[PDB]
Amino acid sequence: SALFEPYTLKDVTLRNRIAIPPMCQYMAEDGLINDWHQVHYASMARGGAGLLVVEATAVAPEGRITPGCAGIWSDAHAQAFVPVVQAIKAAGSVPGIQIAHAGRKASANRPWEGDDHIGADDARGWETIAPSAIAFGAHLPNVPRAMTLDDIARVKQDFVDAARRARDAGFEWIELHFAHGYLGQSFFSEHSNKRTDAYGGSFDNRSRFLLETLAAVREVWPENLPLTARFGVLEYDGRDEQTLEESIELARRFKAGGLDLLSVSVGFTIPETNIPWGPAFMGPIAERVRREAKLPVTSAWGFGTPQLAEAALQANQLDLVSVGRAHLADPHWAYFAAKELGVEKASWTLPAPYAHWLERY
Amino acid sequence: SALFEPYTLKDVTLRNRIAIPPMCQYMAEDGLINDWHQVHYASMARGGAGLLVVEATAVAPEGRITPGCAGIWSDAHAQAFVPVVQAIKAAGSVPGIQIAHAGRKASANRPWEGDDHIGADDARGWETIAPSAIAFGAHLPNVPRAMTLDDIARVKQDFVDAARRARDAGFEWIELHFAHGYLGQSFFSEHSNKRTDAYGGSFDNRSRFLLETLAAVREVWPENLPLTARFGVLEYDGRDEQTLEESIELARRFKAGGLDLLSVSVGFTIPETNIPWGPAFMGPIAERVRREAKLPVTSAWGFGTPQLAEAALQANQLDLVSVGRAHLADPHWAYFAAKELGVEKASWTLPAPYAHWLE
Ligand SMILES: Cc1cc2nc3c(=O)[nH]c(=O)nc-3n(C[C@H](O)[C@H](O)[C@H](O)COP(=O)(O)O)c2cc1C
Ligand SMILES: Cc1cc2nc3c(=O)[nH]c(=O)nc-3n(C[C@H](O)[C@H](O)[C@H](O)COP(=O)(O)O)c2cc1C
Ligand SMILES: COCCOC(=O)/C(=N\O)C(C)=O
Ligand SMILES: COCCOC(=O)/C(=N\O)C(C)=O
Numbered sequence: 207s208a209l210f211e212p213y214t215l216k217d218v219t220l221r222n223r224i225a226i227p228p229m230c231q232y233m234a235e236d237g238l239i240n241d242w243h244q245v246h247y248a249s250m251a252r253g254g255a256g257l258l259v260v261e262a263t264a265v266a267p268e269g270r271i272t273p274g275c276a277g278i279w280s281d282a283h284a285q286a287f288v289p290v291v292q293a294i295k296a297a298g299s300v301p302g303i304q305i306a307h308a309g310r311k312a313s314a315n316r317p318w319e320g321d322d323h324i325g326a327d328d329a330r331g332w333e334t335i336a337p338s339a340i341a342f343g344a345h346l347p348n349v350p351r352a353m354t355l356d357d358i359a360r361v362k363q364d365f366v367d368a369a370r371r372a373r374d375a376g377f378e379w380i381e382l383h384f385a386h387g388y389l390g391q392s393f394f395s396e397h398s399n400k401r402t403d404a405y406g407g408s409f410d411n412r413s414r415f416l417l418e419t420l421a422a423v424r425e426v427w428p429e430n431l432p433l434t435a436r437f438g439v440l441e442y443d444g445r446d447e448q449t450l451e452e453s454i455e456l457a458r459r460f461k462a463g464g465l466d467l468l469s470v471s472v473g474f475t476i477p478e479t480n481i482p483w484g485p486a487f488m489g490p491i492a493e494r495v496r497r498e499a500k501l502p503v504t505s506a507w508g509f510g511t512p513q514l515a516e517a518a519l520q521a522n523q524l525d526l527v528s529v530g531r532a533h534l535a536d537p538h539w540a541y542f543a544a545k546e547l548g549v550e551k552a553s554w555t556l557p558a559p560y561a562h563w564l565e566r567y
Numbered sequence: 568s569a570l571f572e573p574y575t576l577k578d579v580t581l582r583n584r585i586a587i588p589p590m591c592q593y594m595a596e597d598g599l600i601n602d603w604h605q606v607h608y609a610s611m612a613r614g615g616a617g618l619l620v621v622e623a624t625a626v627a628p629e630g631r632i633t634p635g636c637a638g639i640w641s642d643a644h645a646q647a648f649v650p651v652v653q654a655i656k657a658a659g660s661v662p663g664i665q666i667a668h669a670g671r672k673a674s675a676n677r678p679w680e681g682d683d684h685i686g687a688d689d690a691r692g693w694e695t696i697a698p699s700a701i702a703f704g705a706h707l708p709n710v711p712r713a714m715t716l717d718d719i720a721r722v723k724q725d726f727v728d729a730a731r732r733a734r735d736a737g738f739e740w741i742e743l744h745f746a747h748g749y750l751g752q753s754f755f756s757e758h759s760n761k762r763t764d765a766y767g768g769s770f771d772n773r774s775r776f777l778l779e780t781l782a783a784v785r786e787v788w789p790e791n792l793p794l795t796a797r798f799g800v801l802e803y804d805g806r807d808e809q810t811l812e813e814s815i816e817l818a819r820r821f822k823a824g825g826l827d828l829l830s831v832s833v834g835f836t837i838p839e840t841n842i843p844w845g846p847a848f849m850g851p852i853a854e855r856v857r858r859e860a861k862l863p864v865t866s867a868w869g870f871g872t873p874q875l876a877e878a879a880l881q882a883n884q885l886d887l888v889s890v891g892r893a894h895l896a897d898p899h900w901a902y903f904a905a906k907e908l909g910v911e912k913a914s915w916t917l918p919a920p921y922a923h924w925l926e
Binding site for chain 2: 563
């Protein structure tokens with residue numbers, strides 16, 4: 207089974223090709239994680255996945271999506287991740303973390319508490335920042351403040367400091383959140399970036415914030431641990447061929463800048479789109495990025511059945527299959543996948559106190 | 568769906584009829600639970616089950632099954648359970664604990680490490696105690712020492728101390744482990760109890776250790792929290808009608824002694840048996856105990872599909888359905904069952920950070 211072959215990237219070996227992508231839990235307080243996350247992450251790691259990327263973790267307070275988002279903007283915040291890192295490793299999984307800045311989508315309610323921008327009369331809200339003073343629209347109407355050059359320098363240093371903190375906490379895999387309409391994606395997209403300085407306009411200028419952040423992070427992140435990023439390569443906004451071509455070119459530049467693997471996603475930069483949701487729909491797009499940028503890839507959004515994951519790997523569309531919601535439904539999804547694919551001794555995807563009994567059941 | 572109706576017993580209300588029965592993890596050291604158990608129990612409780620009974624927890628060191636068994640024989644051992652209790656309650660489930668003494672089956676290797684008695688020359692082992700000096704046999708050949716009258720008084724006091732500690736640690740449900748061939752079951756069974764004193768021979772004498780332990784625990788366990796026991800009601804040893812009849816009479820005496828619910832199981836007292844394993848096979852036996860002894864019951868051993876669990880409740884065979892191994896495979900099994908049975912807003916069997924997205 208291709209899904210259960212190990213994978214080596216830099217000095218890190220994953221025991222299989224199942225990755226748990228970052229999934230915000232909205233359960234932190236002032237950026238500090240707690241027993242919600244400790245159990246959540248430890249249980250999924252014991253489930254058998256080879257790589258667990260911790261949820262979008264804000265590099266600065268205003269870069270959280272919501273008041274429940276995790277943060278890593280101080281050393282105290284980083285120390286809180288140490289028992290999570292250690293529990294993921296104790297389970298035989300590899301701990302990774304996505305470091306993030308929500309941009310114009312920041313200062314929002316939790317998804318089950320309105321999912322919308324916080325009202326200006328609510329004491330929990332804060333001022334958002336973005337490349338240009340333009341609102342996402344729809345349920346996110348708040349207009350962000352347009353960043354100055356000093357803001358750009360500051361946010362880049364925040365990504366650097368966060369990467370250094372993640373390193374010292376023991377994470378073995380880092381993912382820069384350049385996707386999903388948050389800060390990084392919004393610098394790249396012409397929908398959200400109307401700047402007239404060095405950080406907007408041309409392809410080189412729109413790419414600049416992302417390349418400079420990657421390069422600044424590369425100086426502090428160890429050469430022997432995977433340096434990755436998530437990036438929305440198209441928007442389904444009627445501009446897909448031109449946008450995908452530009453995104454693939456940016457992926458080539460990421461590779462030239464030391465990126466080890468790209469998590470290929472959708473932009474979500476604006477609401478006026480027509481995303482063709484369906485099983486494994488990102489397969490052909492991830493395959494094109496992988497082949498044309500010559501970089502390992504993962505993807506998500508509908509690979510969460512054992513046969514779809516297996517087929518994507520056998521077709522060389524992906525190097526790792528990210529399975530998100532199926533792990534919220536069943537933290538032991540990797541064991542379920544091993545049974546479905548007929549892995550020898552599939553119960554031993556789990557630790558002994560479970561594996562011994564499910565072998566004979 | 569009957570499986571998702573709440574259940575009230577004494578002052579305790581379970582949010583559904585799914586119970587996670589005690590399941591030894593063999594991951595403790597010197598009786599102390601640790602990060603294995605914390606995550607294991609918290610994750611299953613978040614999965615949606617209404618009641619989570621923590622694994623067999625030894626009332627005394629020699630009462631552990633293996634060197635990896637949990638214990639509650641000191642206040643420090645009890646304090647280690649406090650974060651497990653808090654995490655189960657935080658998930659909206661009810662925390663219970665099974666207090667236990669392994670008797671002649673004690674001093675054994677972990678199941679994935681031979682599953683057999685530790686050799687008498689191996690320093691990891693210890694001397695075992697039982698009603699009589701007679702071995703289980705097969706992979707458990709070690710002959711226990713027959714308990715003295717002082718041993719009997721001490722072990723009863725150990726059960727009392729364990730119940731007091733479980734109470735003070737915040738458990739809302741207690742289960743005395745009188746099943747599965749361990750100490751309590753071995754006092755009741757004529758296979759293992761050859762005593763000639765007040766604790767063996769007649770039905771009254773074989774019942775005595777179990778009834779006296781229940782009465783002693785009743786003194787320290789709050790009246791407003793369910794007091795339960797697990798008990799093997801037959802052996803599949805060719806003596807089933809006579810054994811079942813006597814076991815139901817003992818269950819009537821448990822009820823008279825304040826027992827609130829009986830977990831109905833198989834005795835496993837000796838190896839020379841023919842247990843007819845199959846889907847929901849305990850259903851008819853649990854129903855007979857429930858109806859004849861007029862006690863609420865749970866049972867296990869093959870109810871772990873949503874339709875089998877629902878059928879057993881609808882047929883009034885059980886009041887709670889215990890689902891064990893399916894929860895080791897999938898800690899969120901209660902959510903899987905809610906979807907299968909068409910529960911309205913089934914994803915909200917889980918907490919919000921999962922439920923919102925699975926809807
Ligand atoms: C609750 C939840 C939280 C998520 N959080 C993040 C996140 O923090 N960062 C990110 O890049 N993607 C996030 N995602 C998107 C997932 O990583 C993944 O791409 C998506 O769930 C699709 O994969 P799936 O079909 O296997 O669930 C999240 C998704 C969900 C459902
Ligand atoms: C790993 C494991 C540990 C168990 N530990 C206990 C225990 O500590 N006390 C007990 O009474 N039963 C114990 N049992 C028996 C279960 O509680 C339950 O009766 C059995 O698993 C059958 O139910 P199921 O078919 O839903 O798994 C254990 C079973 C397993 C597989
Ligand atoms: C509609 O947005 C889909 C893409 O955004 C995400 O997946 C995410 N973080 O990256 C969330 C929702 O927290
Ligand atoms: C052969 O299985 C006997 C039944 O005994 C149990 O279920 C148990 N504790 O009660 C274990 C195995 O720890």
